[PDB]
Amino acid sequence: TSRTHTSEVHGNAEVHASFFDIGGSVSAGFSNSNSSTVAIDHSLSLAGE
Amino acid sequence: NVSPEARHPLVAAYPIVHVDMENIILSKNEDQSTQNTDSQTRTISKNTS
Numbered sequence A: 001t002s003r004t005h006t007s008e009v010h011g012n013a014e015v016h017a018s019f020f021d022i023g024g025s026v027s028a029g030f031s032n033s034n035s036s037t038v039a040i041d042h043s044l045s046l047a048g049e
Numbered sequence B: 001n002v003s004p005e006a007r008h009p010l011v012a013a014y015p016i017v018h019v020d021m022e023n024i025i026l027s028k029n030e031d032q033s034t035q036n037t038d039s040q041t042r043t044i045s046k047n048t049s
Helices: none
Strands: A005-010 A013-017 A023-027 A027-034 A042-048 B043-049
Touching: none
Parallel strands: none
Antiparallel strands: A005 A027, A013 A023, A042 B043
16 A cells, blocks of 8 residues: 655746747746555465475 | 423423414494486476466
8 A cells, every 4th residue: 555745846938939929927826636556466376396 | 382491390381371462453334335326307388367
């Protein structure tokens, strides 16, 4: 059984150009995460010698 | 076999025996043993997750 947490910080920017339209945009933000996992196993092993 | 000098009544006839060692053979009592062995195995693990 496990559960994870993720932190994130980024900023991207895209600049637009045209015949007479020129602009450059920016952005900012942050994202979080919260997982929850489980795992169940079942095994067999026959060994001769 | 009484030697001639001792056939006189006044000379004593007696033996002079003496043991001398010519060789000494020691044999170290010790037991030693070797062992060879070889083995094969086979395991077939069937597993679920």
